Symmetry: D2
Subunit: 121 residues, 4 copies
Amino acid sequence: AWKGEVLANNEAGQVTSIIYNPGDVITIVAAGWASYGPTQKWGPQGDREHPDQGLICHDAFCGALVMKIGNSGTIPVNTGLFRWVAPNNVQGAITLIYNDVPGTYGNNSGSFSVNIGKDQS
Amino acid sequence: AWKGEVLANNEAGQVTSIIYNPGDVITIVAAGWASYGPTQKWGPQGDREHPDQGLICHDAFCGALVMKIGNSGTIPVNTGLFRWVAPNNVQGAITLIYNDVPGTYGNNSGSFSVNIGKDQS
Amino acid sequence: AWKGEVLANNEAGQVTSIIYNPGDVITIVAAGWASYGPTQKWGPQGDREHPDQGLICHDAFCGALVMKIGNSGTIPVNTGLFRWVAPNNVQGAITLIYNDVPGTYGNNSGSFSVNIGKDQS
Amino acid sequence: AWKGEVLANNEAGQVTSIIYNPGDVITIVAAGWASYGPTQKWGPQGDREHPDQGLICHDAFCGALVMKIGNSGTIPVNTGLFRWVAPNNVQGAITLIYNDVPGTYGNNSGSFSVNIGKDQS
Ligand SMILES: C=C(c1ccc(OC)cc1)c1ccc(S[C@@H]2O[C@H](CO)[C@H](O)[C@H](O)[C@H]2O)cc1
Ligand SMILES: C=C(c1ccc(OC)cc1)c1ccc(S[C@@H]2O[C@H](CO)[C@H](O)[C@H](O)[C@H]2O)cc1
Ligand SMILES: [Ca+2]
Ligand SMILES: [Ca+2]
Ligand SMILES: [Ca+2]
Ligand SMILES: [Ca+2]
């Protein structure tokens, strides 16, 4: 399993030691408080009131937790994924990323604490 | 495993089919949007800005997800618990409850979607 | 003319030196930031999102500026009134009041700066 | 005297019938709700939580009411000005403007109701 922190201001994302392989079932739990710039903070589902101004992930709110698996596009994580299997041919290290507009990560604040494990399969 | 919804306006809480026994390891993932009265909604960590005016759980914000195990006191869940073991002698059905002040659940709105499973042990 | 400060925690209200007499025309300008309890602050129009939970003035938002003129009920002031005449039979000293629920003024803070003058008539 | 509406999406501003002449004393009262983009609305003091990202007036919040008088730079109005005199060499038609970032007025909404009069002098 992996446990660690993902900073909201980390545009490249936080690489984990989890390599997602074909058939793996994973569970992710995310917690904490972060901002994409405002003095307010939001949890891992982000800000449901804020429009999408060009986010790295269009299927999650600004300020949500998302991930990439190897060379994949972004995949929503939000609060977490329960005994999840990847629906397509994605493989490789999981990187956790804060959902914001590229180039705008420098004013971000806070972090999420994340746990990832592989479940029985 | 159990998957279901917990309404924010449900003062008694949502009973699950998970019976927590000694030594069990459980994982919980919670998602969604709810309110303790305001037109705004918050995720399963609740409203970090709102004071505790007498909540059922003093160790989580107003609007957070909490639980009881059998006859226990409230236990914070928030976004979830990863491969969690109960630290004391608690046993029995898990009930999920929205964290609000007793008697004030009638103006609540929304719900959380929750998954609970027992992990390998 | 009168200028002074209306404290949000002043339940009885701020008496002014203005005695409203029949036929008088008055102008009020109010400015500043105050709270009825929450960490946020609002201007003299108060909080348009907050329901009326027993306000002293049901025709203005919580945290708005209101007034009484001698024997009157509360009258909304908000940001002010321009060359305003009172209703029939309304006369006497103007008192300015923060619009909130009686008995809850103890957790209020901030204040409004207010000017009142009598206009030509 | 002048009364009218200042649209938040009106980048050039709302011209008034008031010509500010040397030695004039004026009173302005402004009221209402507007937005510079977000779902929320703010009064004529604007949004005290939002940083200045290139406002036309750096001495008022985003979403505040401001003015120009003939050749002047922007001057804060907020909720209004009581028996106010202009700085040296400031004269001409008063234009009222919603304080926002140039080129972003297209996603604004709402308006302020404004009265201006000349006072005795
Ligand atoms: C004036 C304040 C307030 C806020 C903060 C304060 O101290 C920081 C003091 C007073 C205020 C405003 C709105 C609500 S909603 C309010 O929340 C309650 C729990 O706390 C109940 O769920 C109730 O059903 C709900 O309507 C509750 C309190
Ligand atoms: C005027 C509006 C706005 C809001 C809603 C709108 O449509 C509903 C239009 C404009 C506004 C206000 C604050 C921010 S913070 C803003 O968010 C960005 C992502 O969207 C970046 O993370 C940036 O670093 C941050 O400062 C962004 C936009
Ligand atoms: Ca940002
Ligand atoms: Ca409630
Ligand atoms: Ca109060
Ligand atoms: Ca704008």
